[PDB]
């Protein structure tokens, strides 16, 4: 494609969008394995995979 892929692709935790308490974060595209998540006031980042 002629459209460059943007970094920080979204990641979800539920197929349905009406779940009450679902976590949601982002996942980096430049570095595969780095993920950031946040549930209300509790957020955390972590990177697992090849460097």
């Amino acid at each position: 494609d002629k459209v460059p892929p943007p970094a920080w692709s979204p990641v979800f935790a539920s197929a349905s969008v009406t779940t009450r308490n679902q976590v949601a974060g982002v996942r980096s595209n430049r570095w595969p394995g780095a993920v950031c998540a946040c549930a209300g006031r509790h957020f955390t980042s972590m990177y697992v995979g090849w460097g």
Binding site: A15, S16, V17, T18
Partner: protein, 52 residues
């Protein structure tokens, strides 16, 4: 060699085969709680059926 040399005259059985499968009504109901069921489309008019 005996196994390979056995005659097997496979003939057309008069009855169509029927499948032996356990009932899946219970399991199908459990699956339906996952995901959002899309609103069915009225065959008469392509607009979706009324909903709440």
């Amino acid at each position: 060699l005996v196994k390979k040399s056995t005659f097997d005259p496979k003939e057309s059985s008069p009855l169509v085969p029927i499948p032996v499968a356990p009932d899946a009504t219970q399991t199908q109901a459990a699956v339906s709680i996952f995901g959002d069921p899309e609103l069915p489309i009225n065959p008469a008019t392509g607009e979706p059926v009324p909903a709440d």
